[model samples]
Target: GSVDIEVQDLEEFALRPAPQGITIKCRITRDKKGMDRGMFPTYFLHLDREDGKKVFLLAGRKRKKSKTSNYLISVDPTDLSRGGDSYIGKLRSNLMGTKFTVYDNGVNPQKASSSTLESGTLRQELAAVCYETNVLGFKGPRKMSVIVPGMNMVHERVCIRPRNEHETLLARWQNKNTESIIELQNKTPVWNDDTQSYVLNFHGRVTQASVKNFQIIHGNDPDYIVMQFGRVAEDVFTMDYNYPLCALQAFAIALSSFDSKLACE
Candidate 1:
């Protein structure tokens, strides 16, 4: 059917307004009731809102359709029947999963709009590992660096760290860096000798099982809550934040907690 082209320019339609404080949960799923089963791993993100509305995000890598191992981000309407999938962005990673680049929605991935949602090299504690010996064995403190190109001093760049800390005696016996780690675990803001102000205050549960959640607070207002991350399932977690810049970084850091196997299968 032929249709009238009222609007030839597509950029206008492509521009999406920044969502107002999105509340989303990312759950890792491997198989389901003999319907979808494979060695390929995928992450199903559920979006729950105050208005009783629900949405979903599908993050996974295509085996034959693609060459490099990159996870594609797509927007899917809330439906168990499999329909309404739209491209949003993608996460490109290396063989080791240390470096990552976030691309905007397109047949060919591009930098996020104006670089607003870009993630830098991901850093994780080497000693952090789970009891099992596998790609998903990393159960340690994790963080992902973020860059907001044109922001001022305070908002120029930020880092996200795990809210949980290593056991006191274990950390003490392990290294002399326990003091700084304790400060972060306590949600104490990092002091900047150059800026003469605290950078950011990140705090979370004492242990993964203690509460299955964590938060980020302002350096000055340690009592004021800035953002929060919590676990809803063994491999699922929820995140809620007021600031747009902090949202993706927080989400990415949370994603790092999962083992590589959980992501790549």
Candidate 2:
């Protein structure tokens, strides 16, 4: 086998895209239900690889009162899986309260390719307030802003967003795909003819359900499906993504309705 490389630097990790045609699945636990004794709910992210390998120790530590969640990731080179508190991305949601503020810790590849994310300066005035939104005002559900790391802007983004709100439902009653906590089973993702390249098809059941799955369609040239991730079990969820979508970006876009808004809906 070739020299196995353990990804250490966050910047370099973002630069090299993951292998093509590989849909990496990820996960998160909601109903900690006495999982840990910490005063915070520590949501550990799990990535299910083809060979069952882990890439990052993504931790979501949030304030119980502020309603803001921080999706911080840790990286370890020991391969022992004991990672550190590496701040790759943080999603603090609030105000206008419609946006889940997330920022990249990676350097901009297009413009500032050579510069560090932080010149080691802790300036309070020139803070990088470039964040994104999942649900815009007047919108109800499934409008995600897949902010590319190093490049934080709405226009400079890909959308895990849906065609419209009510993605959790085509209508109110007589609905289908009702993925509730009742008698659920793991539903594998699939693709069909006419599913084009660079497409993200979303899946949901009901507004009351915690299901959030995104079908990453690579292309229809060969009728390919890259990956999927969502709530598979009660209070349990997974996030799987494909190439072009870095792990960090996939983490932000994976969860649909993971967090509820305060003033904005």
Candidate 3:
């Protein structure tokens, strides 16, 4: 018996050069004193890209008369028509910021939806877990691993290893295996075994007013600008990145956790 399984004209994907990278900016919502209080502060985070594309609107709040916190991540634009604000694609989280489940805006509360980038689930999923850093003190240079799935998991995709403890500048990026991949230096260089020379040096700029306000410059090529991050307001910090989406997501989560660790002091 001959079964004709025809395979033909597989439409070729449109050819194009690889994307240099992506740029995403994040701004953290602040409390009255430009700080997020509590073991888990009720807060919101706004994200965007270089071209000014809206990425997400993450909102978190403590339940009325309860210490537990709840969060919502949405992809819809901020709607501030009447009282506060509104958005779409709700992904909700429970207290302790441990787990997040997606649900439709208008559907029954029991229906759980799938987590996807378009639905703004990455941020919540990442925030649910915390990472450990080498630095013991609050204002010291150290490295932190970005854990995924859970803190007990071994999948560390990114790290925030600094050059030394003397300064809060010069962040390094390492792969899961702890190999140096990228380093941000003001004018110095660090050993990079991958290139058999100093790691690709990128300029790092930090604001004196806020340690959270910082940005990195890679190269002159229009596409080489690796990442740009800063605090636009008292409690808002934005990050623009050009990298793999998943990796960037993990990095953002690790960064946020690092910020929280600093705030805990």
Candidate 4:
């Protein structure tokens, strides 16, 4: 923990690339007496950076959209009408291709309240996500991809094993989260095994009764983990990611994991 850094807009921070890699530790908690309490499940994200700076992102799961398929990210944890927070970005999921479209942070809840997209100066497409094997030409990972369009271009490829495709019957019995391997650029493997990536240490699960958890190891080493995400309680979970991974991409990638199970089905 360090000094608190005041940031007017997290979207600005989200756009800036982290050369040394930065980590944002976040916790998603449900709100009981919130504005949209009865309509749907409303959860707030507390994203904390390493230096002690943090931001709150509000989210809402569509009532019938595969449970938690759609999500809205905002700087303020509440609606702007009642003097709440501001809007940042949104995650839109579709069942057709198991695809996800992420509109980056730029909207100000004060203005253009109806727009849930990236507007004003830049192009329409900001980021996109889809299941592996789904992306043609790319041959790797049985997991997924997050493509962020930029001047030079960059993409994050990774995978979370399919629920029914567990390696063994015992693995299915244990039901542990399969670790994800994140690779920069395309799905091609890197020579610097260090360029590759977490879920658990040993192939064995510590305790079946313990809450589930997943992590992003910096490279191939578990100890070099750059991010950690796990369930703290039923409606509470924490996620931390740093360096090579930027905030928007990280948020988008994490949101992709919360998509509808249409792919597996």
Candidate 5:
């Protein structure tokens, strides 16, 4: 049985050169503090052995799409992490033939939604759970962490701005709140009544369960929020990740789904 699948012509994609070599591009973007956060962009350049060579690209600030400013040296992958042989050697082994695209730190929808990037659902789930426990820090072993990243790590310090009285209520609940309840916030100055005002929120402390799970993850310091997930021999870091501070995050996301599933019973 033969079937023909009609494909629409993609002008930009058809005209672009298919990756055929080992060179990579790195870009820099500004964080909330306006400081430079480096980006590593590399990609698989075809299945050829020559394309598999390990290349350490440098990060540079974008002057414009066509120009960059930082004249940086190529650092050995071994130089970036704690153990040279462990991290770099792992990078050297895994980075062969992978393709990378560099971009500035600001919003790059094209890069953010690319299908070419590898997915990490398991890691994401684990992170969501961590967020429930760490950031929100609801008491008990059932807790999870809700960690959303800003320009930097240390998600605990990232400011939480509640949109309206309802969110203010939720914020209070997350903060181990007692007196200032959402019912009050909702009544007097409804969050939607004025665009001028919003609520700023933060989370509770990391629980013992979260600390234990976190240590089991990195085999390093429990205090270090940045967990290294890439193959050590490869020169890559899954640093663009934040752990779920608590189980509440997972519950929040799946609330509807859970409701749907249980509705049948």
Candidate 6:
């Protein structure tokens, strides 16, 4: 396969411009700290590839209370520093995925994209998948990776976060995800004899639910779900990821009520 070495030089490795078509040699990442740059707060990148398409990657640990996620990415039209000003791009709901709710953060949640999504759709697949797994009580994927896939173009960077927060919540739910658990009324907090203080209220409605972390609780709350014996009521305030199907459903309902305004000259 060796024909000719017409151009071979390390000291003078130059890049030539192409009139048309895409030229790709990218460094994609969500976490700026791992971006070979200095440290930075959490942000999400909405990348517009040279091929004229858009994709996203989220950075940092998302706060349970925060709504808008921020991302730092290449803002200059040109990939190189020779390009113009480098700006910061923001991506919000709607475009984040049909599953997300477009909360009011004073910025356009739908800037680069626009479309309508019907309610009760996104989480259906995940719900079915989880339901089957729970019914079977079979082992899980046997792998735990904190990184997302595609965003790791750079050697050390990580991308692709777990979209199914419920599974994660359910697993870690009893541990700390239930730290702020609201009592069943009378302000009665679950107490722990060992710690001599309080116990976490991480309960589910199924068996073998806490074989890995803690014990499981069983109950009958139809509005809520069951992984062990405990049924978690689906209260609007909690927004617990113990199940995202309901979250997605509620988000869809909210999205369906967005305001639309237009003006022309």
| Cα-based lDDT at residue 18, candidate 4 | 44
Instruction: List where candidate 2 sits over 4 angstroms from the true fold.
Output: 1-16, 30-38, 51-56, 63-69, 76-86, 106-142, 149-211, 215-227, 262-265
- The CA lDDT of each predicted structure is 0.36, 0.39, 0.33, 0.47, 0.22, 0.22
TM-score of 5: 0.15
Ranked by lDDT from best down, the candidates are: 4, 2, 1, 3, 6, 5
Candidates 2 and 6: which is better by TM-score?
2
Which candidate achieves the best lDDT against the true structure? 4
For candidate 5, which ten residues in a row score worst on lDDT? 86-95
Question: In candidate 2, what are the lDDT values of residues 1-265, reduced to their tens digit?
Answer: 3223345664455333455544555676653533467554445565554565755535554443335444443333232122334555555444443444344554322334223323321111101111124544654333322223221233222222112233211211113333310111112233334543223344433212122544433223323433355556766777655555555545544432355342122
The sequence of per-residue lDDT tens digits that candidate 6 reaches over residues 41-84 is 23222223445553432111221125543221222323312222
Worst 10 residues of 6 by lDDT: 123-132
Tell me, by TM-score, which candidate is best: 4
Error of 5 at 14 (Å): 19
lDDT value, candidate 2, whole model: 0.39
**Candidate that beats the other on TM-score, 1 or 3, i.e. the better one:** 1
Better-scoring candidate (lDDT), 3 or 4? 4
Cα lDDT tens digits, model 3, 1-265, are 3222121211110001113333334455553332345333434544533355443334433222234333332332133211232432233333333323322234331232553423332222221222234455565333322222212123332322222322111111223221323232111234456555433222443233222433333323333544444555555665544442232232334244423434442
User: Counting only residues 3 or more apart in sequence or on different chains, how many pairs clash (N, Cα, C under 3 Å) in candidate 2?
Assistant: 2
Local error of candidate 3 at residue 236 (angstroms)? 3.2
Which residue segments of model 1 deviate by more than 4 Å? 1-37, 51-53, 57-67, 77-86, 106-144, 148-227, 246-256, 259-265
lDDT of 1: 0.36
Clashing pairs in 2: 25-240, 26-239
TM-score of each: 0.43, 0.47, 0.37, 0.53, 0.15, 0.20
Q: List the residue pairs that clash in candidate 1.
A: 136-259
Two-way lDDT contest, 2 vs 6, winner: 2
